[PDB]
């Protein structure tokens, strides 16, 4: 091997911590989507007809 047990002890704890916190932020970010008057009233345009 390249490194010893006590050599490779605490070198990657930063990445594994920040990576897990990203999963936490991804899990908390859960809501319904945003509604709009645009996408609501575009259904009215089905009866758009020529003069």
């Amino acid at each position: 091997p390249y490194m010893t047990r006590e050599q490779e002890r605490g070198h990657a704890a930063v990445r594994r911590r920040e990576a897990f916190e990203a999963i936490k932020a991804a899990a908390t970010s859960k809501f319904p989507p945003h509604r709009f008057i645009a996408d609501q009233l575009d259904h009215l345009n089905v009866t758009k007809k020529w003069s």
Partner: protein, 107 residues
């Protein structure tokens, strides 16, 4: 199914590759209506893209009936006379543009 359907050997119409290329779509005949909610895709397609479609392809000729129709239709015949009709009933403008484009592309 292959056996139930007819087949053919691959061939082009009068060898359009060597000489000057000609758009082998002859005519398009749109059937839209002043009413009918399904015709929103065809009418808005007539407004924006059918103009530019004609400017892009001066060779092809286009006709629009604009008569009462419960379902809009689009008819397309080629130089050989092979008529092929497809239904544009309740389709978006983007789909119709890609549909008319591939019709212009095919033989």
């Amino acid at each position: 199914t292959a056996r139930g359907t007819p087949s053919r050997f691959l061939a082009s119409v009068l060898h359009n590759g060597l000489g000057r290329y000609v758009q082998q779509l002859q005519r398009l005949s749109f059937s839209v209506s002043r009413d009918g909610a399904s015709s929103r895709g065809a009418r808005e397609f007539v407004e924006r893209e059918v103009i530019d479609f004609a400017r892009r392809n001066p060779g092809v000729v286009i006709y629009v009936n604009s008569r009462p129709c419960c379902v809009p239709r689009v008819v397309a015949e080629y130089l050989n006379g092979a008529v092929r009709e497809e239904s544009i009933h309740c389709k978006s403008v983007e789909e119709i543009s890609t549909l008319v484009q591939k019709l212009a592309d095919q033989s």
